[PDB]
Coordinates of C-alpha atoms and ligand atoms in Angstrom, one line a residue:
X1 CA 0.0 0.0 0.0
X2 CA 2.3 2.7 -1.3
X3 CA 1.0 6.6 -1.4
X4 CA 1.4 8.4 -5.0
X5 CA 5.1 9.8 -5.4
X6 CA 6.2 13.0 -6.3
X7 CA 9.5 13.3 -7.8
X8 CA 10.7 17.0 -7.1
X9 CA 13.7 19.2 -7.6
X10 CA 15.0 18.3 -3.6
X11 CA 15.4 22.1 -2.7
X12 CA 17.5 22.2 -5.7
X13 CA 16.9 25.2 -8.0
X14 CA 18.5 27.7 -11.0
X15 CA 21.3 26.1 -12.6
X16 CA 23.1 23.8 -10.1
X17 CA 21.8 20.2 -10.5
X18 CA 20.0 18.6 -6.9
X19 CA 23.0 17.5 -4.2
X20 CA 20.9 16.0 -1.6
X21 CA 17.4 13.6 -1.9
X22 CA 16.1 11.5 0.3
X23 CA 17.8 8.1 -0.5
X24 CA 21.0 9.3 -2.9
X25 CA 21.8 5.2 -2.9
X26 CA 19.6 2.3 -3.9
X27 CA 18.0 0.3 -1.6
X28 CA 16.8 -3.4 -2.1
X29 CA 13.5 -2.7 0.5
X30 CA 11.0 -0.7 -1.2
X31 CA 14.2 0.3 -4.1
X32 CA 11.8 3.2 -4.6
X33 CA 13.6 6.1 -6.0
X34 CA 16.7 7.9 -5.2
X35 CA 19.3 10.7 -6.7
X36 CA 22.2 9.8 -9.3
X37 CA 25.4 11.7 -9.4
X38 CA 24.7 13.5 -12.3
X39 CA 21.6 15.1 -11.3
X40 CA 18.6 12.6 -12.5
X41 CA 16.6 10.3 -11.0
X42 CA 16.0 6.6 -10.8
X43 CA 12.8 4.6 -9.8
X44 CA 12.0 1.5 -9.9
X45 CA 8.2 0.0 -10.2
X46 CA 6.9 -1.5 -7.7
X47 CA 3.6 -3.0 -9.0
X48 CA 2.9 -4.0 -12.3
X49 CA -0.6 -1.9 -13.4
X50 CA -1.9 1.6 -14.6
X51 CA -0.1 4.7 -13.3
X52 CA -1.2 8.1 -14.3
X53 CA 1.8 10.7 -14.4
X54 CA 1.8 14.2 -14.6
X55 CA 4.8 15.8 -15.9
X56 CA 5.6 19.0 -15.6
X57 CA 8.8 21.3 -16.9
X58 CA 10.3 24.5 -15.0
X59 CA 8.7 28.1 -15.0
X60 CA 11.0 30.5 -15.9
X61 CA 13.1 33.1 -13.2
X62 CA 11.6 36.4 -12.4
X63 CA 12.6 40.4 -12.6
X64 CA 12.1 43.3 -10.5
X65 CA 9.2 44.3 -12.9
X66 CA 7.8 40.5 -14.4
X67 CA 6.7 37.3 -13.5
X68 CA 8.6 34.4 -15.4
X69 CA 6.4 32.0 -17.8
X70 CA 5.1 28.9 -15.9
X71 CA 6.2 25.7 -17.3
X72 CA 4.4 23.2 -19.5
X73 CA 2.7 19.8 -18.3
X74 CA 1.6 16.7 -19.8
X75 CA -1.0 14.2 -18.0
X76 CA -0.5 10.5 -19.4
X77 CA -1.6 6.9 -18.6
X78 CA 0.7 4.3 -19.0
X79 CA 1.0 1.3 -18.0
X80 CA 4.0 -0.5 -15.8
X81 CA 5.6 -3.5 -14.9
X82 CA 7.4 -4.1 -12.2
X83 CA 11.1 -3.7 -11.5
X84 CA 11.2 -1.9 -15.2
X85 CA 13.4 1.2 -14.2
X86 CA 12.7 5.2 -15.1
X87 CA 15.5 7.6 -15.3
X88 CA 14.1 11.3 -15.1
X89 CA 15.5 14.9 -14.9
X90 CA 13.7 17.4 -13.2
X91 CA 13.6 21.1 -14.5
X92 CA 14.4 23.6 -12.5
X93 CA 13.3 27.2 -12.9
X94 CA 15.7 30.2 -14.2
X95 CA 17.7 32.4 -12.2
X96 CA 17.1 35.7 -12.0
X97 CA 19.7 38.8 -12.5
X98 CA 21.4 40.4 -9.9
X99 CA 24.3 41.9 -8.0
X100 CA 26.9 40.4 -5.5
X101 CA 29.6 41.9 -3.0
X102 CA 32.8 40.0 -4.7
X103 CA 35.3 41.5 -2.8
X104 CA 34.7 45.2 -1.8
X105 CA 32.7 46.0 -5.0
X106 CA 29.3 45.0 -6.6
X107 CA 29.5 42.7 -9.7
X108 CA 26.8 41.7 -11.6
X109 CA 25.7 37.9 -11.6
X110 CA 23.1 35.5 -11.5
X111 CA 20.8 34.3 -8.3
X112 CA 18.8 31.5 -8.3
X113 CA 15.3 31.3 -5.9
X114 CA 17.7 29.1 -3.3
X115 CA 20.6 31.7 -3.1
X116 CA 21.4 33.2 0.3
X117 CA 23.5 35.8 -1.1
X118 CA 20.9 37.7 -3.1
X119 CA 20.1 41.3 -1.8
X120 CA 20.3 43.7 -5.1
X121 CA 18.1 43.5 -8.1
X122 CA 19.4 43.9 -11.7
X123 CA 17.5 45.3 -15.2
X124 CA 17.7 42.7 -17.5
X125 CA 16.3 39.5 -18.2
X126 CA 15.7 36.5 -16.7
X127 CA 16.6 32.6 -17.5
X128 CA 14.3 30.1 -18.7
X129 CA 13.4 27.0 -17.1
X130 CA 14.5 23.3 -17.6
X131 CA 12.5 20.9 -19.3
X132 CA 11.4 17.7 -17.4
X133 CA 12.5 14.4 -19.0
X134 CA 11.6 10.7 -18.6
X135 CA 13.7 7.9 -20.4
X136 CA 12.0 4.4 -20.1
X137 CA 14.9 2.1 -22.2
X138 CA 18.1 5.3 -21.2
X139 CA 18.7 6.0 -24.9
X140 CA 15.9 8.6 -25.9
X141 CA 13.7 10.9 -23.4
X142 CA 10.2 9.3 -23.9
X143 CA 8.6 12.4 -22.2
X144 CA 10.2 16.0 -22.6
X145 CA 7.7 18.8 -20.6
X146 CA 9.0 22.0 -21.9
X147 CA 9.5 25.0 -19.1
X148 CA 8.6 28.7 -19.7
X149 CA 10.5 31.6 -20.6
X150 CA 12.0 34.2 -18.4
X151 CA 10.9 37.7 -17.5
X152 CA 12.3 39.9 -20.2
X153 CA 12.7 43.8 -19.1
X154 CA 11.3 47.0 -21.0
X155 CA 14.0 46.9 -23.9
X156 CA 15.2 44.7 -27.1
X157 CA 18.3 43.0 -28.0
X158 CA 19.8 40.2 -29.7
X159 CA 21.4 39.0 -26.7
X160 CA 19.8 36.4 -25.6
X161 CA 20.1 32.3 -25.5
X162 CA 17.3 29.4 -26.8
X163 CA 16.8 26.6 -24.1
X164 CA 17.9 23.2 -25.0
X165 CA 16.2 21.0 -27.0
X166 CA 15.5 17.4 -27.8
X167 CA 15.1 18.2 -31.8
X168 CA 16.7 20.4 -34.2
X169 CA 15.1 23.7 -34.3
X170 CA 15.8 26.7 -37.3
X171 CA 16.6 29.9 -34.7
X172 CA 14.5 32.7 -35.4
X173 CA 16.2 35.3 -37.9
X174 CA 16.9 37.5 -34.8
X175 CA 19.1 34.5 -33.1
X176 CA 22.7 36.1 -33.9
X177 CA 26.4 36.1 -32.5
X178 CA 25.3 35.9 -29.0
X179 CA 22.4 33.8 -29.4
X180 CA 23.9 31.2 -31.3
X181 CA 27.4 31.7 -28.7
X182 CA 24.9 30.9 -25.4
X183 CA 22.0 29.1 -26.7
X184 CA 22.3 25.2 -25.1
X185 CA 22.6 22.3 -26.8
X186 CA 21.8 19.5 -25.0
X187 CA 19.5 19.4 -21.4
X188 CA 22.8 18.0 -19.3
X189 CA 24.8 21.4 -19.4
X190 CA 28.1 22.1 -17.5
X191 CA 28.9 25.4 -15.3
X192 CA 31.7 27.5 -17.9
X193 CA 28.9 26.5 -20.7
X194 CA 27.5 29.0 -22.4
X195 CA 28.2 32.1 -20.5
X196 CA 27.6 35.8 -22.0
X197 CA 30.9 36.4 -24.4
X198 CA 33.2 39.1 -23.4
X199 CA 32.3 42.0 -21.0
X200 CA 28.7 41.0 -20.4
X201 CA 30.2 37.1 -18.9
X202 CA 29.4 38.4 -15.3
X203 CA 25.9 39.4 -16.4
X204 CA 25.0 36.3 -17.8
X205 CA 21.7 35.1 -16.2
X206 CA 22.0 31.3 -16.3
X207 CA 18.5 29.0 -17.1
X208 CA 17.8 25.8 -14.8
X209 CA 18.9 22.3 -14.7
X210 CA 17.4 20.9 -17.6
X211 CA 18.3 23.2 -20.4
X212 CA 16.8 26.6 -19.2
X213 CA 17.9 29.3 -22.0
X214 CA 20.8 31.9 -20.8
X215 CA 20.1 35.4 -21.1
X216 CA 22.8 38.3 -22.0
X217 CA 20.4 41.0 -22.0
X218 CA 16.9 42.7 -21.5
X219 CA 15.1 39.4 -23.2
X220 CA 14.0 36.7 -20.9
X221 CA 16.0 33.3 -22.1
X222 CA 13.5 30.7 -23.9
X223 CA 12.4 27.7 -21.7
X224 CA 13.6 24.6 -22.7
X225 CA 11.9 21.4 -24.2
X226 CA 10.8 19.6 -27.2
X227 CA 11.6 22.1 -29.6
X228 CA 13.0 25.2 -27.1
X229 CA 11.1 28.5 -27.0
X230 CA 12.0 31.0 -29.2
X231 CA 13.3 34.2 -27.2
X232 CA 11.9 36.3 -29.8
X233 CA 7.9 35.4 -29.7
X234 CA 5.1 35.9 -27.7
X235 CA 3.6 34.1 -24.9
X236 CA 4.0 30.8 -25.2
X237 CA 5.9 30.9 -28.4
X238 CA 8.5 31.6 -26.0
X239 CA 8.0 28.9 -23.9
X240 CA 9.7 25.0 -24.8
X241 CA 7.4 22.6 -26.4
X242 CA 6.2 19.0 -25.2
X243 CA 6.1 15.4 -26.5
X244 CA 4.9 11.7 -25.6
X245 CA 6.7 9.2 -27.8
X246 CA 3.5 7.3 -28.7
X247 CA 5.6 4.1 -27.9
X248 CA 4.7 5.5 -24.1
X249 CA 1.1 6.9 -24.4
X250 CA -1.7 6.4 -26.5
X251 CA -3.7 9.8 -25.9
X252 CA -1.5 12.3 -23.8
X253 CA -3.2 15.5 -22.6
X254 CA -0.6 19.0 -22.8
X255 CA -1.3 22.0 -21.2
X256 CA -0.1 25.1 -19.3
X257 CA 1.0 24.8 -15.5
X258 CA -1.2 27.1 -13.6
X259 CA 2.0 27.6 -11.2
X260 CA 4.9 29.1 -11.3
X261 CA 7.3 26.0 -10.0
X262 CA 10.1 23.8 -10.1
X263 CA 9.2 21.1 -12.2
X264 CA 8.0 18.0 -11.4
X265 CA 6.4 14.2 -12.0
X266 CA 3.7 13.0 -10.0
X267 CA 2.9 9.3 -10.4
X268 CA -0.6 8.2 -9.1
X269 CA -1.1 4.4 -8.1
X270 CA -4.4 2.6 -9.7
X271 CA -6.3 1.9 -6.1
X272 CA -9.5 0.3 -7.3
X273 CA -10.3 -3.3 -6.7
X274 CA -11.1 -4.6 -10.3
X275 CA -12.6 -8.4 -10.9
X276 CA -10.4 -10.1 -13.5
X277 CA -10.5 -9.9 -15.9
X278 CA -10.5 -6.2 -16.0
X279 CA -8.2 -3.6 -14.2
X280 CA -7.9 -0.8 -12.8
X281 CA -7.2 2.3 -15.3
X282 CA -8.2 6.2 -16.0
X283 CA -10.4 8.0 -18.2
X284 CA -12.3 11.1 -17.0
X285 CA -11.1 14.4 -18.5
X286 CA -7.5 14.3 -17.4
X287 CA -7.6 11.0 -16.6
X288 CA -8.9 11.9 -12.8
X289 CA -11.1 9.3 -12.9
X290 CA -10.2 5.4 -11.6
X291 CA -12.3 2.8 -13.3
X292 CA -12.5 -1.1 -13.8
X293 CA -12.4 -2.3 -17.8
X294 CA -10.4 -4.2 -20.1
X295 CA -6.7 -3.3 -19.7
X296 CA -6.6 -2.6 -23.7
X297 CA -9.4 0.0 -22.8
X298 CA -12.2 -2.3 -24.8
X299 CA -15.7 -2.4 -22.8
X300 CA -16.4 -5.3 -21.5
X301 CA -19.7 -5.5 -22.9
X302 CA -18.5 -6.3 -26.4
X303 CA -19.3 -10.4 -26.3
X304 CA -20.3 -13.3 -23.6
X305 CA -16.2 -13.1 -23.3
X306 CA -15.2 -10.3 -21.3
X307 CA -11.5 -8.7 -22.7
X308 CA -11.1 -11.4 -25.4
X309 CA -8.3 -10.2 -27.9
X310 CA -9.8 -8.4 -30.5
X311 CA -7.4 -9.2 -33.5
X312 CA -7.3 -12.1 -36.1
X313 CA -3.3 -12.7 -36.7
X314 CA -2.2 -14.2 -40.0
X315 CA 0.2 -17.2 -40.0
X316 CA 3.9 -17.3 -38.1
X317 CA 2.3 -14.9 -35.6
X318 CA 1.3 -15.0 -31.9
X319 CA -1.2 -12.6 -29.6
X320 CA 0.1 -9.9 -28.2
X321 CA 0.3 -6.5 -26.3
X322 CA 2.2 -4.0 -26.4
X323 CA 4.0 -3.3 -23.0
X324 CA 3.4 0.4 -22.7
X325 CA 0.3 1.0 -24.6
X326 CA -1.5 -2.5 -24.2
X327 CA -2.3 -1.8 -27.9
X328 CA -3.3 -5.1 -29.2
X329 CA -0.8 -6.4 -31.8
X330 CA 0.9 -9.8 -33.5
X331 CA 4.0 -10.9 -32.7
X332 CA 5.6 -12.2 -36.2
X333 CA 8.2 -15.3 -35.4
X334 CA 10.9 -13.9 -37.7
X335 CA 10.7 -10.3 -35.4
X336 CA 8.4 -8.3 -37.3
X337 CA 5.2 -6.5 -35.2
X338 CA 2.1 -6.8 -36.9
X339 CA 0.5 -3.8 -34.4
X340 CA -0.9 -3.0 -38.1
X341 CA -3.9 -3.5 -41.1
X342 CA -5.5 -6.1 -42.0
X343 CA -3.6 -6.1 -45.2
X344 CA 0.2 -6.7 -43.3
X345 CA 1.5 -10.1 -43.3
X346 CA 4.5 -11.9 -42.0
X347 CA 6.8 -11.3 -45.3
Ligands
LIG401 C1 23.7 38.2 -38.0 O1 22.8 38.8 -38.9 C2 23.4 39.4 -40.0 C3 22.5 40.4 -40.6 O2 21.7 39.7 -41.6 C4 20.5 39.2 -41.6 O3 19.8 39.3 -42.8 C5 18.8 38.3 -43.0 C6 19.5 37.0 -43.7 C7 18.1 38.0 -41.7 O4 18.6 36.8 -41.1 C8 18.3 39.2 -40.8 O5 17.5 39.2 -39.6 C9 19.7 39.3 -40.4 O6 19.8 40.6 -39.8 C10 23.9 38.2 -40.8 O7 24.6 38.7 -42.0 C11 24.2 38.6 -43.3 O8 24.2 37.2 -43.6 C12 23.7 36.9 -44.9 C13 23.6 35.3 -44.9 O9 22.7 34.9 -43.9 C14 24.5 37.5 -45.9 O10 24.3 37.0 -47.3 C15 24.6 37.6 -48.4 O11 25.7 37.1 -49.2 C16 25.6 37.1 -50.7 C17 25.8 38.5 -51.2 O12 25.8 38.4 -52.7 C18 24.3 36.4 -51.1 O13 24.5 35.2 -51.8 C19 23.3 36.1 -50.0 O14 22.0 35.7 -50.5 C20 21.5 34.6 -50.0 O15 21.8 33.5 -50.9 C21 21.0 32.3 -50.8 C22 19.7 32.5 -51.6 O16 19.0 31.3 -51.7 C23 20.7 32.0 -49.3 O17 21.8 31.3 -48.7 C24 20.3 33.1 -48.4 O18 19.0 33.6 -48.7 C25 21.3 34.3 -48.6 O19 20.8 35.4 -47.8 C26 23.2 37.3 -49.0 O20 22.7 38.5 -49.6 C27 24.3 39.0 -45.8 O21 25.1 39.8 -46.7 C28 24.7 39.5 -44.4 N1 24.2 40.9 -44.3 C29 24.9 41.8 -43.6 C30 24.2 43.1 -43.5 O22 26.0 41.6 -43.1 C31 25.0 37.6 -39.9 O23 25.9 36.7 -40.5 C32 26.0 35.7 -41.4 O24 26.1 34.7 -40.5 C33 26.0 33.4 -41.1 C34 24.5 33.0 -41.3 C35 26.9 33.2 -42.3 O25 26.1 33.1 -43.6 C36 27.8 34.4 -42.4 O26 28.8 34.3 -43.5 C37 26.9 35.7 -42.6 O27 27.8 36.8 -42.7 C38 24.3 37.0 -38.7 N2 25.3 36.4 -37.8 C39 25.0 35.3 -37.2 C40 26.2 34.6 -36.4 O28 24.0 34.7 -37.3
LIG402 C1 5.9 14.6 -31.5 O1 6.7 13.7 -32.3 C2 6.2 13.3 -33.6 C3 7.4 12.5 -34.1 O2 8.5 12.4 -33.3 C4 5.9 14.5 -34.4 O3 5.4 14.2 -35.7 C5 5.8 14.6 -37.0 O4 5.0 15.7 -37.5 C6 5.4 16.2 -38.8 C7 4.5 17.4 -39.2 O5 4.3 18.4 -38.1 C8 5.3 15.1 -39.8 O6 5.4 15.6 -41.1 C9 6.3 14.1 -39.4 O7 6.4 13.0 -40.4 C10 6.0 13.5 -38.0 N1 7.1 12.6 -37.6 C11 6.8 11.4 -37.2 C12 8.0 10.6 -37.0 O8 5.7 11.0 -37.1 C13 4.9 15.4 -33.6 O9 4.4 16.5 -34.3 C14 5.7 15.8 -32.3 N2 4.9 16.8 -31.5 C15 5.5 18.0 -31.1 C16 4.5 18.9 -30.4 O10 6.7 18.2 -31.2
LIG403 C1 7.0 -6.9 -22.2 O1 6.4 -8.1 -22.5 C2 7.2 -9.2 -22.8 C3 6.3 -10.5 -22.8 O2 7.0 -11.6 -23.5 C4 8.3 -9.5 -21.7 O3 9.4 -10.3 -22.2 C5 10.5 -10.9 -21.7 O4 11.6 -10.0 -21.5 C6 12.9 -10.5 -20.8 C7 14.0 -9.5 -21.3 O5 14.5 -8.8 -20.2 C8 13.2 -11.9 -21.1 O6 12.8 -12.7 -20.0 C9 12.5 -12.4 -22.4 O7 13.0 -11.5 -23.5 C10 11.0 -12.2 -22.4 N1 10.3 -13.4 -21.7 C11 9.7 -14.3 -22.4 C12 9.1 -15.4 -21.6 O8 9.6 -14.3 -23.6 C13 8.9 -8.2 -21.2 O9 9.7 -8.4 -20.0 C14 7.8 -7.1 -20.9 N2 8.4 -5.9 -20.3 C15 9.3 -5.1 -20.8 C16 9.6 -3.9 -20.0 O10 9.9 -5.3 -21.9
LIG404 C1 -18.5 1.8 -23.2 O1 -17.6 2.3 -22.2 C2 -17.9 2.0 -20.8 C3 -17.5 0.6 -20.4 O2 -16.3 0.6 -19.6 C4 -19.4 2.2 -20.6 O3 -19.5 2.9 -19.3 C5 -19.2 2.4 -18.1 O4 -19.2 0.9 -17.7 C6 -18.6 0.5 -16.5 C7 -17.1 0.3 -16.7 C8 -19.0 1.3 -15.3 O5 -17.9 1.9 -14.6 C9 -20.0 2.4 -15.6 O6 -20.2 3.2 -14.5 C10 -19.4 3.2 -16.8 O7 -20.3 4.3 -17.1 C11 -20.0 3.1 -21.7 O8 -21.3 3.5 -21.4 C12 -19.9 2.4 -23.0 N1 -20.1 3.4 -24.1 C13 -21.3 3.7 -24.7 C14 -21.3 4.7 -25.7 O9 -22.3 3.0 -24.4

């Protein structure tokens, strides 16, 4: 009987990864989920069934004069087997510009949310948020929830970076020397990367762990994501983009945080008490609502034979489903997937 988890940023926020979660080793009792070294997080099912996740990316960091954009979220079902392991990076939000007492002087720099050295506002900018990735198989993110762009200030330059991406984006025509110089390429970013060139270095305002776009100037950096905001829209344009991998989810929902926040997934257990057999799975609008029906999502009612397979597979192939999606499909002996027409065959 295990309560819905809620894997968070750990205090952690701006650009410098999480240090410190609640386990930071495995365990073998209740393996549960715990920090790796490089800033994501592992967690292992538990029970093989539905779960309904909601994955959200970073909002961006804040000015003086502006609220940062909140992040973007996805709602999904999926559904689990147990002892598969997730690997997942949480977005943090943008830092914000300011001033620090280096020495006997005041030299501009970059606070995050967390700082306790943060007393004097600057005029420029703020970072974007990170997205929020989820790898199933640790070769491609499954889930990318893009985060929000940062406050921009009154003016307009060129001087500002794009969040990371998962895809390759075409910068808007406005992307230039500096854009292209601190604009991040991948969501795993290292602390001398990407820094304002030349004079404005110090003023660099850096974008949260998970690809949170830089910003050089009055522009707030793009939030990270699918494809990454562009620095140079409006409203959401400059916010990251989302996507499911539809090897993961059949019908994931997208929309906009109504928070300002860290990112964040929250993965909700399937608690109803289902007679085989049918189980326990989610449909309502955002799937809020637990139900009992044939895993594949068929109604029961279809024949005398509740949940009977609902395909007809030709030849040197076998009954199946897939192990995300429980769409029904037909296991061809010489490899191939049938999870197609009619008209497919073995070769
Ligand atoms: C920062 O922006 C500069 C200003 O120019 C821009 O104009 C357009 C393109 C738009 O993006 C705008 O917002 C920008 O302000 C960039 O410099 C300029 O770069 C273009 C190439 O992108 C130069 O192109 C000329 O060169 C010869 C001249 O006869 C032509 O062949 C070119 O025509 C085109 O040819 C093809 C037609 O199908 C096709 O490749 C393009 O449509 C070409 O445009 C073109 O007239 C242009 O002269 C130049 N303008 C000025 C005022 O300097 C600047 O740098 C550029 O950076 C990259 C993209 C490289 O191509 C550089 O060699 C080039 O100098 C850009 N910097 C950065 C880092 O982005
Ligand atoms: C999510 O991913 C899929 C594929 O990774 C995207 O689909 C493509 O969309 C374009 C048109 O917009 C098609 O012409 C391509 O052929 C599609 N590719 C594939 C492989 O199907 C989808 O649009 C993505 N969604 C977002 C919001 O980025
Ligand atoms: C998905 O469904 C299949 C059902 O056959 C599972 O398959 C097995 O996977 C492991 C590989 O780690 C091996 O024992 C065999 O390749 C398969 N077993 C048999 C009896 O064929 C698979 O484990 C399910 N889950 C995942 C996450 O792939
Ligand atoms: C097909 O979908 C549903 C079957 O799961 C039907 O509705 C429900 O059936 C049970 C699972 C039970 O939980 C009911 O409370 C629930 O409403 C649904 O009515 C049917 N669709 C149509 C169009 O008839």
């Amino acid at each position: 009987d295990i309560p819905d988890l809620f894997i968070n940023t750990c205090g952690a926020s701006g650009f410098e990864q999480p240090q410190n979660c609640d386990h930071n080793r495995e365990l073998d009792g209740q393996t549960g989920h715990f920090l790796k070294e490089d800033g994501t997080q592992q967690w292992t099912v538990p029970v093989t069934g539905f779960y309904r996740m909601e994955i959200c990316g970073a909002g961006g960091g804040s000015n003086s004069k502006a609220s940062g954009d909140t992040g973007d979220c996805v709602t999904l079902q999926v559904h689990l087997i147990e002892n598969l392991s997730l690997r997942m990076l949480i977005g943090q939000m943008g830092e914000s510009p300011c001033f620090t007492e280096h020495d006997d002087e005041l030299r501009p720099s970059s606070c995050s949310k967390i700082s306790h050295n943060y007393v004097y506002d600057g005029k420029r900018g703020a970072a974007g948020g990170g997205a929020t990735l989820l790898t199933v198989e640790k070769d491609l993110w499954n889930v990318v929830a893009g985060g929000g762009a940062g406050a921009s200030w009154d003016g307009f330059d060129m001087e500002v970076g794009y969040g990371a991406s998962a895809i390759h984006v075409k910068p808007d025509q406005r992307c230039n020397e500096t854009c292209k110089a601190v604009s991040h390429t991948d969501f795993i970013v290292e602390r001398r990367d990407n820094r304002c060139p030349g004079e404005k270095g110090e003023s660099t305002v850096f974008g949260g762990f998970g690809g949170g776009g830089n910003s050089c100037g009055m522009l707030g950096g793009s939030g990270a994501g699918y494809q990454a905001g562009n620095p140079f829209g409006k409203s959401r344009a400059r916010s990251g983009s989302s996507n499911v991998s539809i090897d993961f989810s059949k019908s994931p929902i997208y929309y906009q945080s109504e928070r300002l926040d860290e990112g964040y997934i929250k993965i909700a257990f399937c608690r109803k008490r289902c007679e085989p057999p049918t189980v326990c799975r989610f449909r309502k609008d955002y799937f809020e609502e637990e139900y009992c029906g044939c895993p594949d999502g068929s109604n029961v009612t279809d024949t005398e034979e509740a949940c009977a397979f609902p395909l007809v597979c030709p030849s040197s192939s076998t009954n199946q489903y897939r192990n995300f999606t429980y769409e029904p499909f037909c296991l061809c002996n010489n490899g191939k997937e049938i999870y197609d027409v009619y008209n497919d065959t073995c070769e």
